[PDB]
Symmetry: D2
Subunit: 250 residues, 4 copies
Amino acid sequence: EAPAAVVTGAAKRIGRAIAVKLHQTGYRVVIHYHNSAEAAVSLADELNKERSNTAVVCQADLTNSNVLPASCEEIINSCFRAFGRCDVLVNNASAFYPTPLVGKTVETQVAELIGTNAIAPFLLTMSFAQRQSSNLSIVNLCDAMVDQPCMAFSLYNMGKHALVGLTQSAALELAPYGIRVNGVAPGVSLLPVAMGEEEKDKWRRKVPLGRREASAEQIADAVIFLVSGSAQYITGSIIKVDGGLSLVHA
Amino acid sequence: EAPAAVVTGAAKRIGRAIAVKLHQTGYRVVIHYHNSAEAAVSLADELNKERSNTAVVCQADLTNSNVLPASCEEIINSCFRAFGRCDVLVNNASAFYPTPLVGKTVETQVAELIGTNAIAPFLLTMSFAQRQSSNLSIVNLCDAMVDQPCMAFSLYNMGKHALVGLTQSAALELAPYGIRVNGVAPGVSLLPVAMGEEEKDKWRRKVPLGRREASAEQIADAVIFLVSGSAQYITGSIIKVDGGLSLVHA
Amino acid sequence: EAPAAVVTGAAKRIGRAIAVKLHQTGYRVVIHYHNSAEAAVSLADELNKERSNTAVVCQADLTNSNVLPASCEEIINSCFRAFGRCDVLVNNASAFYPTPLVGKTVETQVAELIGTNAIAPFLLTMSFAQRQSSNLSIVNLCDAMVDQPCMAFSLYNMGKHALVGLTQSAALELAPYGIRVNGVAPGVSLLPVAMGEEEKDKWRRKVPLGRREASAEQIADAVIFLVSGSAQYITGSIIKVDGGLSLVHA
Amino acid sequence: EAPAAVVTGAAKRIGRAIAVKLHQTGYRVVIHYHNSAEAAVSLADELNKERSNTAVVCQADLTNSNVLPASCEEIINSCFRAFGRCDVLVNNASAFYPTPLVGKTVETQVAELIGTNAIAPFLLTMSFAQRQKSNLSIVNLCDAMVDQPCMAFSLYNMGKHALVGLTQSAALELAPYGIRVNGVAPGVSLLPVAMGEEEKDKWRRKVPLGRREASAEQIADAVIFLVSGSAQYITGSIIKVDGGLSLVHA
Ligand SMILES: NC(=O)c1ccc[n+]([C@@H]2O[C@H](COP(=O)([O-])OP(=O)(O)OC[C@H]3O[C@@H](n4cnc5c(N)ncnc54)[C@H](OP(=O)(O)O)[C@@H]3O)[C@@H](O)[C@H]2O)c1
Ligand SMILES: NC(=O)c1ccc[n+]([C@@H]2O[C@H](COP(=O)([O-])OP(=O)(O)OC[C@H]3O[C@@H](n4cnc5c(N)ncnc54)[C@H](OP(=O)(O)O)[C@@H]3O)[C@@H](O)[C@H]2O)c1
Ligand SMILES: NC(=O)c1ccc[n+]([C@@H]2O[C@H](COP(=O)([O-])OP(=O)(O)OC[C@H]3O[C@@H](n4cnc5c(N)ncnc54)[C@H](OP(=O)(O)O)[C@@H]3O)[C@@H](O)[C@H]2O)c1
Ligand SMILES: NC(=O)c1ccc[n+]([C@@H]2O[C@H](COP(=O)([O-])OP(=O)(O)OC[C@H]3O[C@@H](n4cnc5c(N)ncnc54)[C@H](OP(=O)(O)O)[C@@H]3O)[C@@H](O)[C@H]2O)c1
Ligand SMILES: Nc1nc(N)c2c(-c3ccccc3)c(-c3ccccc3)[nH]c2n1
Ligand SMILES: Nc1nc(N)c2c(-c3ccccc3)c(-c3ccccc3)[nH]c2n1
Ligand SMILES: Nc1nc(N)c2c(-c3ccccc3)c(-c3ccccc3)[nH]c2n1
Ligand SMILES: Nc1nc(N)c2c(-c3ccccc3)c(-c3ccccc3)[nH]c2n1
């Protein structure tokens, strides 16, 4: 019987690339999404054409709130409902925007940035563990630049640092259950179409390895390694996939 | 005119030592507290008996909620209303208890642990910066053991990692205003007197330097250095005060 | 045609497992060794029996001295002599023994521990670089416990820290050549066969994931990943393969 | 009776500033130097004019070699011979020049960069500890930028990483003797007066806190803190004194 994986924020970009690689490797997938309903269903369709009844969608807001634990529990539940098991959780969904210290209220900024980058991963990790020759693991999408943060992104950066802490704490606590918990830390990966090509090229020129951003596939390759039998002794590790960006001084 | 400082969780233990030592150095202090009202007031009395009009109290819950930004704005405002300035912020208040992955609801555990240790510090930082020759700084009480966390303390450890992120991010962002942002990271300090003799001895025996915990005053000494004119180029630094504990393998 | 790899200290234990996996993946290998001539010759024989003239041996002391640069240059030369190319360098050889601060002279201890763990890697890196679809990379065998070092192993730990610095520096500097430079950081692996099982068990008991040391093959799996086409944007990254050991407090 | 300190590379720049501040604090000092004889003697003269019999010079090359351990032993011995005690060691002396991977021989580059920055500190630390076999401590001058190194400075960076390892290993091992071991990590400080102005300003512009380099006295300030009675529980800590430089992404 095929194993199953939940990928958060999997309608597009890096999360989709990860869901696709897992599905190709043989996983059944839960494609979680928030607003990108069309994209999520379109991916589920593609994947189901390849192999029937191997993909489902699950909509959830991962903003912090008093019902977030319920939402996270329901994401894990949807994998068990659809596939009878949940082997892998990938925490990929992430809000990202500036929150300067000097339209959204600060309450909202705190809830969205901390919720998606840290608290939801924690609550998904709880639910994944509680609901349990298998190879169970969790992969967190971290950030290679967490110690050299973008100006005015404090809440986003706090969230990513907390996700490091969770990766470590959960690796330690879930080790007795056979559940490995690791991370992948992109540098600069999929640049948005809508960026001034002046601005995209400015990020690209910063990367020592090729003067280019990582492809989604390159990030997903590291995820697939960590979930593989080739990483059976690896837990609490964060693999940077940054082309050396984080090594470059100002 | 004397500079003024806000110390959160200052009614006892390490926060009290930090308030006392700042006061001894010449600061006027706002004693923030949550439940320890009698000890907060008694400290204020003692400090005011020493120099008139140099200490006030400000009560607030720093649990995460939709009213926390206002609570944090009021803590900073209390310094201005009393003393007409606010030169130093010390983020010391902290909830600490286990939150296993497998009475409080999980949403309360998240609000308390992430609120006190990370979000409140962030909102207090926003309010402090927004209100601003001078020697302005912020000191965050971090944790020397953040990469080797206690078993079953994921949320606390998440909060403390986030606080590292805030320290770095706010140092970078506030440096143009001349506001330094640093941290002090205790190991083990002030073991609860009701913790077991076996359990205390076990922690003490692990500390390389002197096989004993730090006094509150030793933690406060590092805070004082960071706020002083002897640390005028220091920003985004976290000083461990741990007797070498974090260096000891399992 | 087939790529070629140099593995230092490859006659036994982890280095041998690395050379065998590389070979199995289709690499031709230089098997470098120092004292273990029988094991190195025998390993080359076994691999050549599998595919004709796909392995060679090369002896060299990698102790620091005035002839170490020529020695290292000759190891890289030996790969080109045998195979006309050198795509991968794995810095695995390592002296490991205590050097207390309070029958070898201290200058010999310095020379062996810093030579094998850092200086020889740097010199090999230079010679490798100087000689250069393509997929070139270096993997350095680091140590997951470098920040929580064994008591009285200062010189070893200094060497391993130096090796981290080389991994970063060389990743930055060799990126323009498309040479990636990464590390693998074992926790406890392949405990000495001669170590009593009861001492083996003291280390084993520390490991959260499975209360077991890593196999040589598990270490080798991380090396294989890093040299593979699935790691082509990864440079300056150190992958811990430690079962959570470095996460455990004293 | 006054305590005594050895400061290596103390004739000029940051070491000189550290020796001066230690002397103003009440220490007698050994001013170690290599080539800057006139500067060293001029400094000793000036400190002795302030307090008779409180400063000596000690010449030694700290390049790695088979006699480096005897040279390091003689430096420590010079302090006991002049003052009858040695309370503080500051490892400040440092060779700094590029060593690219692709007039000095490489043997010499290795001996100078690894000797001065790492091996001499280790040997001096041994001789220090053995002569003690009060508030005894060691301060190592580290580098805030060691994870974002200068292009083509691999050996210097390996040296400085090794020095972090020494700081940690020695703090752990010397703690039972009451000897604390810490570091101060400058970012950019005291630019060579002769460095081109455009290059000076290129570095200055990078620093968030004031867009300027640290003064030598600001670096000394943090050394003075670490040797003081206000840092009695601090060991194995490295204090960055960098104006936020290390926080800035490429
Ligand atoms: N791209 C990079 O260069 C880079 C760099 C560093 C780290 N990373 C990390 O790698 C991961 C993937 O990066 P990316 O660029 O692919 O991510 P992204 O496009 O910015 O976001 C991924 C998904 O997060 C989901 N999301 C956003 N807010 C949400 C909310 N409130 N509730 C639930 N889901 C929400 C969105 O789902 P819908 O579209 O369905 O609404 C979005 O498609 C992230 O964790 C990111 O931080 C990426
Ligand atoms: N003690 C150690 O060994 C150690 C180790 C690592 C880090 N630290 C850090 O050093 C700092 C001080 O340590 P500590 O042991 O002195 O702290 P603590 O005694 O555990 O807590 C300090 C204060 O935090 C306040 N607090 C708790 N929950 C709160 C809430 N919901 N809202 C507002 N305030 C709240 C409490 O105020 P009331 O008493 O007024 O309710 C309490 O007095 C903390 O940040 C801690 O994490 C300490
Ligand atoms: N085993 C662990 O748990 C562990 C933990 C952390 C890091 N690591 C690292 O992973 C790598 C492999 O570990 P291991 O346990 O397999 O290593 P090892 O058996 O201790 O050493 C590997 C080889 O290093 C070679 N070597 C030693 N001194 C040398 C010298 N002066 N010149 C040239 N070669 C020399 C030896 O070659 P000959 O036998 O031919 O003389 C030896 O077989 C090492 O870098 C090690 O530090 C291992
Ligand atoms: N300046 C900065 O911005 C900066 C940045 C990061 C770290 N640091 C660290 O802070 C410390 C002081 O920096 P600095 O700029 O003042 O240092 P520096 O001027 O570059 O070097 C200090 C002294 O090192 C001594 N030295 C060099 N080679 C030697 C050898 N082979 N044997 C013995 N002594 C030798 C020299 O003594 P003689 O003059 O007597 O020959 C020199 O005066 C160093 O450890 C440095 O790495 C400085
Ligand atoms: N959820 C999410 N989405 C993103 N698009 C990013 C990015 C990012 C930022 C700039 C260019 C490309 C990607 C980054 C990022 C952060 C710091 C440095 C580089 C990229 N983090 C992101 N997280
Ligand atoms: N707010 C708060 N209060 C505390 N009492 C602690 C402690 C702590 C944990 C054990 C003994 C003494 C102190 C710790 C702690 C955490 C990790 C390792 C060691 C101590 N953190 C704390 N935070
Ligand atoms: N070259 C070499 N050989 C080794 N055998 C080791 C070890 C080591 C240490 C203890 C048990 C097994 C292996 C370790 C090691 C170091 C620090 C913590 C744990 C293991 N490093 C080694 N390096
Ligand atoms: N012994 C020694 N001397 C030095 N002059 C430096 C410097 C340095 C590099 C550039 C400007 C000013 C100082 C640096 C340095 C290194 C990396 C980043 C920034 C400064 N390290 C030094 N070490």
